[PDB]
Design a protein around this nucleic acid. Structure first.
Ligand SMILES: Nc1ncnc2c1ncn2[C@@H]1O[C@H](COP(=O)(O)OP(=O)(O)OP(O)(O)=S)[C@@H](O)[C@H]1O
Ligand SMILES: Nc1ncnc2c1ncn2[C@@H]1O[C@H](COP(=O)(O)OP(=O)(O)OP(O)(O)=S)[C@@H](O)[C@H]1O
Ligand SMILES: Nc1ncnc2c1ncn2[C@@H]1O[C@H](COP(=O)(O)OP(=O)(O)OP(O)(O)=S)[C@@H](O)[C@H]1O
Ligand SMILES: Nc1ncnc2c1ncn2[C@@H]1O[C@H](COP(=O)(O)OP(=O)(O)O)[C@@H](O)[C@H]1O
Ligand SMILES: [Mg+2]
Ligand SMILES: [Mg+2]
Ligand SMILES: [Mg+2]
Lengths: 327, 343, 255, 340, 319, 250
DNA sequence: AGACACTACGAGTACATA
DNA sequence: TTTTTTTATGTACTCGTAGTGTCT
């Protein structure tokens, strides 16, 4: 049953009408498939934007419920070498369909992990067999694809999901589930997603499990922040104010109590302070240079471990020494 | 010799009585023993104390050990052959004898000895002595991270090292940490008095022994070996002004420091590179070379505080570089050039 | 529950040998009528469809329709550990779980009970070979195998042409070009050597040689290969077992 | 059977003897185990990614969850634990992991469904995912995305940055918090009471203070102090000094000596005292930590001096985190902080 | 949706050498060679999407007439092209007897010749030298440096260059006239701008815009095709103020879904191919970009790292 | 001076190749009765034994019992580089071992081997009590082992209530062969003998049995002796014994 | 019944890598 | 004017013992 799948998998779009966020790409793809002129597609975008869902719904619209048989779907989980290309892809492109009449579809999902020899062998398979089959390449990084292979497909850039699309999907989920969400909680949820539907769905499931009730109550910002362990804007601005204004000992005590009372992480506080100070209008850019350099160095050091107290004191001292030049 | 006079039990140690009492505490209940990590200066006597602790956990047969040969196959047709020092109660592994293939040996041999149960006709677990855990790369340490916890009823690790810097935090947490401070000059001189009384050495003055201590920097392995070496030049009778026999590499490093402080040029940099090549080609690590060269450059009285500060700063920078690199000469020559530019 | 006790052991061995290195993941379906299994090739070019009724089994008992998926490599590994003189028994519990392959000797108490863990394959069981065919023919297995593995040395493609009472296998390659023309004829003293052909429209279509070289491997089961061809229709290569049938659906090349 | 396991646990180190067996034994990581308990009644366990400092209880949490889910019978048949002591290249991920994910779930027995929920999926946990190469990680993407109906993936790591972004997006992130004195004093007191550890007032809270968010190291230090107190047999209570002497902490007087040498003194005496201090084996990480605490918490230095001391201590810790020579780094740090 | 139509890159693929709008010199050379005969061994190199494969195909077709099927041996990178193939099949084709007109020769087309192994390339030397009177070799590659010097010494070298805006505009106008598509001057200019001398990419973007919006306008082109990636990175690196470069990186690159790895790789490539600043400044910028890339590859790829890279670049530019 | 004569070199070739994968150095003791050999694996997990009496030698002269320590490398090279009558020759202080290949041909070739001195520790061999003792044909056990080794890497032996069970719980599945005692009259070789006092259940490594079953050609029947805490005993009739230690518990 | 050409799956050896 | 370097997956070549269908 579908009631056992996680929310990321349970709410996977099955038709092109359930893929929000991408409107310029979805409409053009629908027109491609309606007029018949469907070229080789290259869906390039960040993770969780809806490329795999889009191509699956497209193949479903093209072939019907018989998608899993009339389409050759290869991914990084499967062995994709030059011999794999030579045999499988060429034999799939050269022959005809077994169940119906129509062009074939080769979905090379996550093709950014393919070998250079495989792409060099495939670039002439795409150009030779182009009247009976098609190629759709999904990618997160366009630098791992050879320019020859990159020039044979129509490139569609999947932009990060905007506010309206994620809010629409959240409303759809809140209709599908017996769940209520606060407005400010919804805004905070949009803020910690960066256009990733997977993260939104996962944390929504986690906060629904966190409610500890039969779901007669509403999900507030406190529930979200305690679920994802993210710092609140209130504590963020309090720590920033204590660093900028209060003394060294006072700022140290404030940072310690804020990061120990809620169990917050230093990397999350660093990211939040960076996001907040981005709107700060300052004097000569030397302070910004010092701030960015020292904060990136501290982040790279945190990414490898060490003493958390030493790194917190380093963050405080770096911010103070950077703002000491803005006078 | 350092081998003829070495303690074999906990009651035979002659320094760090607090550490001996802690080892007796830890070996009182031997079956409820966690993994251990002995850290401290090189040459303090931690490898002897580990064997003395095993001699208290098991019978005296722990010292009757044998060297066997074990073979392993990598992902390719290359084969590795390494010697394991095994005993009817424990085994000793030193992955510092190979390159990046230590993780395979670690995982395979440790899983084998974990699944393997001890034999009879000689307690319940079989100890593993990981010698020089600093050479273990992060991959082998990560592989051992879960092996330490999955099999805790048959395999207890006693990892011997000189500095916990390259040891990852999970491994540090997964075992007790025991520090072995280097013995003071008094205990070293006391041991030297006993060994020269047993070896029939003629001493006109006792203070020379103290000087040996002051020439070993707490190291007993260096102190005893240097005493036996200078006893061969003085023909079993040390004089009141017997010279201190320094190793050849130390004298070469001192001459290199002299060449650095006297002349600072590129033509001298070529000779410095040649000396560094000659030192590296004769089984001398580059970290020790850098440490000794920096410490000898700081001892030069011709320089001032401004020079010594920059010297130690460049030394730390290039130490990080060498710890992050593999071509040791590429960092040693850079450090030497930066020191020449500083002076 | 499921109990399928064969009469012999080498029968299922040859049945799996028919398409051993042809497909990988199969999903058998056991019902009251018999075992039926369709499997698509890794390149999605040909479809193997096997049907063994209750005739080839010594004992058959199936309560509800059960679906057991498995990889052919592990199935071959399990079947190779069985002696050709043993008796094979497929057993399945109430819910679909690891199929129990039981080897029971007829003289000594040798109970070889292997348990093959199943796979979870998308049971997209379709309904195929329910379409009208333009041309049907039948010819001995040895002749087809000879022609196929003799034309496969001259090229990698084989064009089959069915004209008015004319069968033609053409192989056009680089080092040469071959053409075999067999004519329909029925013998009376040897009814198994007859080459029957019922054609309604001329057929011209090409296939790959790497797939025919694996299709001809099924000639060890039966001796009369049937071939059904049509324009835009999967080529049906049928071997007739004594209880069911094994049919390969090959996809024609694109001219 | 059961009695043998009880005796083996009783004759095991305190780290493994008191390993949490249920989702209730975990004390401080409540936010994650609340969701894990609420999903135990449901059947929609998502792909999870545990990340945090070492010794916070990630492996213990996932083991307790798998136990409470499957029972001690299906615990050995519906799990796939892949640790860092095994090969985890592209080949392993493509063959073994994918074959196990494509497998069907094992049929539960009659006794399993009566006491345990027995979800219709299995769990493939990957401990120490930091060592997994990026290509072997990207290979897991569709493996975990298509077979989610029958298997569930649980990644465990310390540095969440070592895992690629798509894998971190596919899994729900559970951040395990450091176990300080406040949220682990209850567990430490329970461990001390179960072992009759006669300690003083401010010992346990001090132990975790030395642990810096690590309950495993705290339990190990408690076991060591208990052994050292039982060997003596004096019947007294363990003191904070007896705990900090075996934990690698530099005494306060030796630290005051270092502060006096840095405050007043030139390169020569500082170098001599550093050479003498390195003879007594102390971990430079703990020395840097104590120096940082002293310099930051002292209300006797200027803000301009405090920013510089914080940056210098940060640089020294970052350089020490790479396996550098402790003596050289400590001397460089003390000299740099001696020059104003 | 039962059947699809051929794309305009394949449908309008040139079948005669006159329809090629590439380099006029080499095209006229190949035209005269095919008209007179005696085609020599050749190696055609260039960039993707400028008319290299189509050029040699049209040459072989117009040179062989109806004997193209039996006189041309086409081998791509999709087929096995090892030492065994060169030893057996290529040698059998070169030794194969074929009665041709007294001005033609058998042609062996080898697409993507820069991917053949060293053994095959070495074995091809005597294969092409001993049968140079009845068999001719035409290689089509992107990098002439991947082909060994002994092979290059026995053939002519034709280096195809980028297609100027005039040629691509003429070809697009011809395609529009043959398709009767409503367009606009700004739309065609935007297509040429986003093509970057790539004729195939230009035709593909044109077909996409036509089938997605109907009217070829700069608005629709920029809506369906984003601005070129290297140009925005160049504008970000060449910014005079740190705030301008930070705003560019935030809005144009980071808010549009460009990964950090792609950003740092494009920055490295632009700084390498830059010519506005001195060599030392470019070297320091490449050093900083590589220092940032070393962190991006370790999984620390975020917006803060790119911001710090831009800050360090501006500090370097701050004398 | 030791002189031994096998009528066929094939017997010694099969003998040496039976265990040429589990050891590298091997000591052969030579006494009045015959030749005896024992060798310990490099991992000290399995020991190999061997005894050949005067029944197999066409001629045997041994003045003084002596221990010959030979490596597997050179002897394996000599046995694989070359039915015919084989002759082993050694002199006083046997620094070399000569192997003459001599009934219808007069061609001979040999390459000498220099021996080593290995401290072959003497561990007593006791015939203690066993909870279960069984004997079954060598080919059947070898087939069972190489059939179960494909599934898992650990073979479980379960002897209970006059029934033996060879189980193997692998990744792709699980195999289980259950065998009942059988004695046959027309063929005395296909007989199953077994006597027990306690149902025993142990687990052994499959990689060790995969090399143990290489001695399936030395004799026709193999004996398995299993007890509670003592290691398992694999007996092959020349008499040779393998002591295999199982896995502790889980 | 068996010998030996044909053959195709497997261990070993290198060779690059933008 | 000249020699070497740890490892990791993909690619290509080679000999090669081996398993089975066929002919003197
Ligand atoms: N535009 C969208 N509308 C609705 N749900 C979406 C959308 N994009 C993503 N999702 C959700 O996120 C899940 C994963 O989407 P995918 O298409 O697999 O992500 P992706 O774009 O392929 O990126 P990858 O797989 O990490 S490279 C889907 O099953 C949906 O539940
Ligand atoms: N939250 C907790 N509650 C109780 N005991 C805990 C907790 N966390 C850790 N422990 C103890 O510490 C031991 C180690 O737990 P682990 O789960 O292995 O730590 P960890 O998070 O896996 O650290 P790693 O493996 O280095 S990343 C457990 O067996 C417990 O004794
Ligand atoms: N000069 C040209 N005139 C007209 N169309 C052209 C021209 N160059 C390229 N095209 C179009 O681009 C398509 C593909 O061109 P190709 O010749 O395959 O590119 P290429 O120059 O060979 O570079 P590759 O194949 O990527 S290495 C052709 O089918 C034409 O539609
Ligand atoms: N307590 C002790 N009393 C006397 N000699 C000792 C003592 N501890 C160590 N030694 C000497 O140290 C030598 C071994 O040093 P070792 O332990 O290998 O150095 P490390 O501590 O670097 O491993 C022995 O020869 C032994 O004589
Ligand atoms: Mg995807
Ligand atoms: Mg863990
Ligand atoms: Mg081309």
């Amino acid at each position: 049953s579908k009631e056992n799948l996680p929310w990321v998998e349970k709410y996977r779009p099955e038709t092109l009408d359930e893929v929000y966020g991408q409107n310029e790409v979805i409409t053009t793809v629908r027109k491609f498939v309606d007029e018949g002129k469907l070229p080789h597609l290259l869906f390039y975008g960040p993770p969780g934007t809806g490329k795999t869902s889009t191509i699956v719904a497209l193949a479903r619209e093209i072939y019907g419920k018989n998608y899993s048989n009339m389409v050759l779907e290869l991914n990084a989980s499967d062995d994709r070498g030059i011999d794999v290309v030579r045999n499988q892809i060429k034999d799939f492109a050269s022959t005809r369909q077994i169940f119906s009449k129509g062009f074939k579809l080769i979905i090379l999902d996550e093709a950014d992990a393919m070998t250079n020899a495989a792409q060099n062998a495939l670039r002439r398979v795409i150009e030779r067999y182009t009247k009976n089959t098609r190629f759709c390449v999904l990618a997160n990084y366009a630098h791992k694809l050879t320019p020859a292979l990159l020039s044979r497909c129509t490139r569609f850039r999947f932009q990060p999901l905007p506010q309206e699309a994620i809010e629409r999907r959240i409303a759809n989920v809140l209709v599908h589930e017996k769940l209520k969400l606060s407005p400010n909680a919804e805004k905070a949820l949009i803020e910690l997603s960066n256009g990733d539907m997977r993260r939104v769905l996962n944390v929504l499931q986690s906060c629904k499990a966190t409610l500890d009730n039969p779901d007669e109550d509403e999900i507030s910002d406190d529930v979200i922040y305690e679920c994802c362990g993210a710092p609140r804007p209130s504590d963020l601005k309090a720590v920033l104010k204590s660093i900028l204004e209060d003394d060294w000992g006072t700022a140290h005590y404030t940072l310690n109590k804020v990061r120990s009372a809620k169990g917050l992480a230093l990397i999350d506080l660093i990211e939040g302070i960076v996001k907040i100070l981005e709107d700060y209008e300052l004097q000569n850019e030397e302070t910004r240079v010092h701030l960015l350099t020292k904060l990136a160095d501290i982040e790279y050091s945190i990414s490898k471990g060490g003493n958390d107290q030493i790194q917190g004191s380093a963050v405080i001292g770096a911010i103070k020494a950077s703002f000491e030049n803005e006078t | 010799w350092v081998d003829k006079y070495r303690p074999k039990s906990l009651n035979a140690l002659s320094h760090n009585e607090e550490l001996t009492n802690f080892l007796k505490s830890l070996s009182d209940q031997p079956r409820d023993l966690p993994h251990l990590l002995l850290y401290g200066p090189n040459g303090t006597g931690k490898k002897t104390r580990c064997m003395a602790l095993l001699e208290s956990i098991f019978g005296p047969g722990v010292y009757r050990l044998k060297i066997d040969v074990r073979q392993f196959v990598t992902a390719s047709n290359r084969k590795l052959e390494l010697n394991v020092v095994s005993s009817p109660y424990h085994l000793e592994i030193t992955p510092s004898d190979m390159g990046n293939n230590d993780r395979i040996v670690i995982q395979e041999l440790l899983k084998e000895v974990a699944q393997m149960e001890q034999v009879d006709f000689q307690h319940r677990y079989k100890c593993v002595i990981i010698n020089e855990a600093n050479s273990l790369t992060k991959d082998a340490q990560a592989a051992l991270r879960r092996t330490m916890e999955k099999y805790s009823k048959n395999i207890r690790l006693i990892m011997v090292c000189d500095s916990m810097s390259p040891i990852i935090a999970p491994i540090k947490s997964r075992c007790l940490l025991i520090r072995c401070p280097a013995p003071s000059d008094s205990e070293i001189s006391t041991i030297l008095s006993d060994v020269v009384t047993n070896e029939r050495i003629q001493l006109e003055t006792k203070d020379i022994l103290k000087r040996i201590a002051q020439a070993s920097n707490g190291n007993l392995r260096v102190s005893l070996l240097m005493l036996e070496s200078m006893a061969l030049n003085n023909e079993l009778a040390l004089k009141s002004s017997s010279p201190i026999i320094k190793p050849d590499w130390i004298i070469v490093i001192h001459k290199l420091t002299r060449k650095i402080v006297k002349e600072r040029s590129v033509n001298s940099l070529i000779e410095c590179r040649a000396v560094l090549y000659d030192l590296l080609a004769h089984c001398i690590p580059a970290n020790i070379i850098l440490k000794e060269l920096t410490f000898s450059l700081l001892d030069v009285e011709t320089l001032n505080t401004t020079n010594k500060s920059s010297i130690i700063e460049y030394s730390s920078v290039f130490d990080e570089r060498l710890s992050l690199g593999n071509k040791a000469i590429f960092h040693l020559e850079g450090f030497i050039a930066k020191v020449m530019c500083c002076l | 529950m499921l109990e399928a006790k064969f009469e012999e052991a080498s029968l299922f061995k040859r049945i799996i040998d028919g398409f051993k290195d042809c497909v990988q993941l199969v999903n058998f379906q056991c019902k009251e009528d018999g075992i039926i299994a369709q499997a698509v090739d890794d390149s999605r070019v040909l479809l193997v469809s096997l049907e063994i009724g209750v005739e080839a089994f010594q004992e058959y008992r199936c309560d509800h329709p059960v679906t057991l998926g498995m990889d052919l490599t592990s199935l071959s590994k399990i079947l190779r550990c069985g002696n050709n003189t043993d008796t094979l028994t497929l057993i399945a519990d109430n819910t679909p779980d690891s199929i129990i392959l039981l080897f029971e000797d007829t003289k000594k108490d040798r109970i070889a009970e292997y348990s093959l863990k199943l796979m979870d394959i998308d049971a997209d069981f379709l309904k195929i070979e329910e379409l009208q065919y333009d041309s049907t023919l039948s010819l001995p297995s040895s002749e087809f195998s000879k022609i196929v593995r003799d034309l496969s040395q001259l090229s990698d493609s084989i064009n089959i042409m069915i004209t008015k009472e004319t069968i033609k296998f053409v192989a056009d390659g680089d080092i040469g070009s071959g053409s075999v023309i067999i004519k329909p004829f029925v013998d009376m003293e040897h009814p198994e050597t007859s080459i029957k052909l019922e054609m309604d429209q001329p057929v011209d279509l090409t296939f790959g040689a790497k797939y025919l070289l694996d299709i001809i491997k099924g000639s060890s089961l039966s001796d009369r290969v049937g071939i059904r061809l049509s324009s835009e229709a999967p080529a049906l290569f049928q071997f007739d077992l004594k209880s069911g049938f094994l049919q390969f659906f090959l996809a024609p090349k694109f001219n | 059977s059961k009695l043998a396991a009880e005796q083996s646990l009783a004759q095991q180190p305190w780290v493994e003897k008191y390993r949490p067996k249920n989702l209730d034994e975990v004390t401080a990581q409540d936010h994650a185990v609340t969701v894990l308990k609420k999903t135990l009644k449901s059947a929609n366990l998502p792909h999870m990614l545990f990340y945090g400092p070492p010794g916070t209880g990630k492996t213990s949490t996932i083991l307790a969850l798998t136990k409470e889910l499957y029972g001690p019978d299906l615990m050995k048949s519906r799990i796939l634990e892949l640790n860092a002591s095994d090969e985890r290249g592209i080949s392993i991920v493509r063959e073994k992991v994918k074959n196990f994910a494509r497998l069907t779930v094992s049929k539960p027995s009659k006794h399993d469904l009566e006491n345990y929920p027995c979800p219709p999926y299995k769990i493939i946990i990957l401990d120490e995912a930091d060592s997994m190469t990026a290509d072997a990680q990207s290979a897991l993407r569709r493996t975990m995305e298509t077979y989610s109906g029958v298997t569930r993936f649980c990644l465990i790591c310390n540095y969440v940055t070592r895992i690629i972004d798509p894998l971190a997006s596919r899994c729900s992130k559970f951040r395990f918090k450091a176990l300080d004195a406040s949220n682990a004093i209850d567990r430490l007191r329970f461990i001390s009471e179960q072992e009759n550890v006669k300690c003083d007032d401010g010992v346990l809270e001090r132990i975790l203070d030395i642990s810096a968010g690590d309950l495993r190291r705290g339990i190990t230090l408690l076991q060591s102090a208990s052994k050292g107190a039982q060997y003596l047999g004096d019947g007294k209570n363990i003191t904070s000094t007896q705990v900090e002497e075996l934990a690698g902490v530099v005494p306060h007087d030796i630290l005051i000596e270092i502060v006096e040498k840095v405050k007043s003194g030139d390169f020569d005496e500082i170098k001599k005292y550093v050479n003498t201090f390195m003879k007594s084996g102390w971990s430079a990480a703990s020395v840097v930590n104590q120096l940082h605490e002293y310099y930051i918490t002292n209300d006797n230095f200027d803000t301009n001096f405090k920013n510089q001391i914080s940056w210098l201590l940060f640089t020294t810790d970052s350089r020490l985190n790479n396996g550098t020579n402790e003596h050289i780094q400590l001397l460089n740090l003390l000299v740099k902080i001696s020059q104003l | 949706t039962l059947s699809l139509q051929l794309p305009w890159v394949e449908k309008y693929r040139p079948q005669v050498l006159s329809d090629i709008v590439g380099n006029k010199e080499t095209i006229d050379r190949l035209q005269q060679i095919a008209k007179d005969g005696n085609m020599p061994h050749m190696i055609i190199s260039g960039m993707p999407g400028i008319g290299k494969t189509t050029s040699v195909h049209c040459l072989a077709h117009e040179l062989l007439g109806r004997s193209y099927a039996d006189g041309v041996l086409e081998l791509n990178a999709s087929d096995d092209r090892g030492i065994d193939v060169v030893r057996n099949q290529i040698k059998h084709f070169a030794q194969k007897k074929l009665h041709l007109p007294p001005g033609k020769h058998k042609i062996v087309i080898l697409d993507e010749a820069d991917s053949m192994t060293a053994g095959a390339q070495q074995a091809l030397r005597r294969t092409m030298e001993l049968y140079s009177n009845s068999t001719r070799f035409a290689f089509a590659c992107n990098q002439s440096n991947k082909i060994i010097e002994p092979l290059q010494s026995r053939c002519a070298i034709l280096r195809y260059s980028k297609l100027s805006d005039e040629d691509v505009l003429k070809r697009l106008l011809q395609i529009i006239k043959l398709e009767d598509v409503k367009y606009t001057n700004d739309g065609l200019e935007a297509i040429i701008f986003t093509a970057e001398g790539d004729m195939r990419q230009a035709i593909n973007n044109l077909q996409s815009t036509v089938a997605g919006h109907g009217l070829v306008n700069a608005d629709n082109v920029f809506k369906i095709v984003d601005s070129p990636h290297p140009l925005i990175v160049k504008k970000m690196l060449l910014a005079s103020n740190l705030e301008d470069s930070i705003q560019i990186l935030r809005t144009d690159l980071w808010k549009k879904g460009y990964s950090s790895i792609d950003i740092v790789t494009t920055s490295f490539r632009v700084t390498k191919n830059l010519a506005q600043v001195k060599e030392s400044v470019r070297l320091e910028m490449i050093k900083e970009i590589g220092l940032t890339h070393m962190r991006i590859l370790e999984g620390v790829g975020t917006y803060l790292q790119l911001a710090s890279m831009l800050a360090k670049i501006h500090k370097l530019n701050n004398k």
